[PDB]
Every structure is written in structure tokens, then in C-alpha cells.
Amino acid sequence: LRKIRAAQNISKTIATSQNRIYLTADNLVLNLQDESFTRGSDSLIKGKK
Amino acid sequence: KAAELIANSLATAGDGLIELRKLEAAEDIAYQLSRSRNITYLPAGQSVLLQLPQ
């Protein structure tokens, strides 16, 4: 059984192997725009008294 | 010098000495060639906060 033990260890050491992927994340970004931007206007002839 | 020194030490140490020097080295090579360990997982686990009614 010393032989078997050694065999266990050898097989165990040799055998193991794997690879995995992980992806830690979380999307947190804040885009804040307040009073600032433009709309649009048409053309109209105006005049004030 | 190292090799010769080993040889001489081995000679004084007798055959038994070389024998296991051989296994030491073999162990080292086999091990270096194959180093590894592995754990596989299924993602799980949670922080649970539960409320109990009274």
C-alpha cells in the first residue's frame, strides 16, 4: 500500500487542472445635465409696442 | 563542483544515498512539471435579511 499511496498522490497531483472566467462589474455612471441645452424656435415676425 | 560533491557524498553515503537522491529529484521534476490544484464552483450564497411578523 505504500505503492498505492504514492500512486494516489502522483495521480492526484498530475490530474488536477481547470480554468474559469469571472466577471465582476456593475454599471454605475451618472450623467446629469440640468438647465442647459437648447430647444428650437420657428421664424415669426414679432414686434412690441 | 556541486555535481562532483554530490557524487562524492553519494559514494560515502553508499548506494542507498543515491537511490533516494534519485527519487528526490524525480519528485521535484514531476512536481514542477505538474503543479496544480482546483476548485470548481456554482455561484451561490446570499445575504439574507428577513422580517418576521409578530
UniProtKB/Swiss-Prot annotation, chain A:
Protein with pleiotropic attributes mediated in a cell-compartment- and tissue-specific manner, which include the plasma membrane-associated cell signaling functions, mitochondrial chaperone, and transcriptional co-regulator of transcription factors and sex steroid hormones in the nucleus. LC3-interaction region (LIR) is required for interaction with MAP1LC3B/LC3-II and for Parkin-mediated mitophagy. Induction: Expression increases approximately 3-fold upon entry into G1 phase compared to other phases of the cell cycle. Also induced following inhibition of mitochondrial protein synthesis by thiamphenicol. Belongs to the prohibitin family. Expressed in myoblasts. This is Prohibitin-2. It comes from Homo sapiens. Phosphorylated. Tyrosine phosphorylation is indirectly stimulated by IGFBP6. The mitochondrial prohibitin complex consists of two subunits (PHB1 and PHB2), assembled into a membrane-associated ring-shaped supercomplex of approximately 1 mDa. Interacts with ESR1, HDAC1 and HDAC5. Interacts with ZNF703. Interacts with STOML2. Interacts with ARFGEF3. Interacts with SPHK2. Interacts with COX4I1; the interaction associates PHB2 with COX. Interacts with MAP1LC3B (membrane-bound form LC3-II); the interaction is direct and upon mitochondrial depolarization and proteasome-dependent outer membrane rupture. Interacts with IGFBP6 (via C-terminal domain). Interacts with CLPB. (Microbial infection) Interacts with SARS coronavirus/SARS-CoV nsp2 protein. It is found in: Mitochondrion inner membrane; Cytoplasm; Nucleus; Cell membrane. The modification N6-acetyllysine is found at residue 12. The chain holds residues 251 to 299 of 299 of the full protein. The gene is PHB2.
Curated annotation (Swiss-Prot), chain B:
Induction: Expression increases approximately 3-fold upon entry into G1 phase compared with other phases of the cell cycle. Also induced following inhibition of mitochondrial protein synthesis by thiamphenicol. Protein with pleiotropic attributes mediated in a cell-compartment- and tissue-specific manner, which include the plasma membrane-associated cell signaling functions, mitochondrial chaperone, and transcriptional co-regulator of transcription factors in the nucleus. Plays a role in adipose tissue and glucose homeostasis in a sex-specific manner. Contributes to pulmonary vascular remodeling by accelerating proliferation of pulmonary arterial smooth muscle cells. The mitochondrial prohibitin complex consists of two subunits (PHB1 and PHB2), assembled into a membrane-associated ring-shaped supercomplex of approximately 1 mDa. Interacts with STOML2. Interacts with MAP1LC3B (membrane-bound form LC3-II); the interaction requires PHB2 and takes place upon Parkin-mediated mitochondrial damage. Interacts with STAT3 (unphosphorylated or phosphorylated at 'Ser-727'). Interacts with CLPB. Interacts with CD86 (via cytoplasmic domain); the interactions increases after priming with CD40. (Microbial infection) Interacts with SARS coronavirus/SARS-CoV nsp2 protein. This is Prohibitin 1. Widely expressed in different tissues. Belongs to the prohibitin family. The modification Phosphotyrosine is found at residue 31. The chain holds residues 219 to 272 of 272 of the full protein. It is found in: Mitochondrion inner membrane; Nucleus; Cytoplasm; Cell membrane.
